[PDB]
């Protein structure tokens, strides 16, 4: 009966020394077991595994508390889905483009690259240590854990096409946006006026207009009475806002926005690029950079900086 010592973990923070029997598979001793994202459940220990860290499923109360404190989910499939994604994302390339960590195109990942670039330019604090830790690694040029976590949190698999807005909506649920506040006023000539207050994620996302300036002046929306009403922004307290709309030709102007999602294609099949405003306009398309003084193209999300806005409309 020969043995080696290894560490098991659910979080890569808390390591648990195990003595393993070299004549049994990891799966027989631990249940589902991963080594650097690879599924080694049906593999027998190797002398070179001595002192290495293996991920296991949280199969006791100690490991369940550790997994919940790290990932902020009790979903028992999570660790498995993370590890399966990570097995592929650790093989992607993470180009430095204009001081930002991007992703070289692979496995329909344009929506993920656009989300990754966006997250480096808006002010957001994630609540799960897993997302905070992986975000810092992605900033340091190694975004594999961060991309695999995004896929697991969004219940998406490597290879699937995706929507930046839906990705941002899920990630914003795991961010501290509690103090974000939005006040709206809607004016219908038939129904009269309606003031509402939104908090949290709803306070920073809007669907139907790209222009923050037009949101402040008033946008036309369908009223429940079948007429068009005017909705405008009374008050915003947030460090950014995200303005989305079905893709349409749109002019982006240097210095008037943080960054933007360009989308070419249809609802099922298409490709994202990312536009960012620095000293001029940069278009980042995975590894590919192109720069211009002006931009006109199919835009679906625009991000703006904010702190505190109050309308002067009385
Ligand atoms: C930007 C785009 C989109 C958003 C909203 C309205 C649109 C209308 C026409 C064409 C595209 C539209 N996403 C990716 C499509 C999309 C949404 N959810 C998805 C889930 C998987 C794959 C693609 C998608
Ligand atoms: Cl793509
Ligand atoms: Cl963070
Ligand atoms: Zn009305």
Curated annotation (Swiss-Prot):
Changing residue 231 to Q: In strain: Gamma/P.1. Residues 1-56 form the Ubiquitin-like domain. Zn(2+) 4 binds at residues 188, 191, 223, 225. It is found in: Host endoplasmic reticulum membrane. A zinc finger (C4-type) spans 188-225. It comes from the Viruses. Inhibited in vitro by GRL-0617. Residues 70-314 form the Peptidase C16 domain. The active site is at 110 (for pl-pro activity), 271 (for pl-pro activity), 285 (for pl-pro activity). Changing residue 65 to A: Partial loss of ISG15 cleavage in vitro. Changing residue 68 to A: Partial loss of ISG15 cleavage in vitro. It catalyses: Thiol-dependent hydrolysis of ester, thioester, amide, peptide and isopeptide bonds formed by the C-terminal Gly of ubiquitin (a 76-residue protein attached to proteins as an intracellular targeting signal). It is a multi-pass membrane protein. May form homohexamers. Interacts with N protein. Responsible for the cleavages located at the N-terminus of the replicase polyprotein. Participates together with nsp4 in the assembly of virally-induced cytoplasmic double-membrane vesicles necessary for viral replication. Antagonizes innate immune induction of type I interferon by blocking the phosphorylation, dimerization and subsequent nuclear translocation of host IRF3. Also prevents host NF-kappa-B signaling. In addition, PL-PRO possesses a deubiquitinating/deISGylating activity and processes both 'Lys-48'- and 'Lys-63'-linked polyubiquitin chains from cellular substrates. This is Papain-like protease nsp3. It comes from Severe acute respiratory syndrome coronavirus 2.
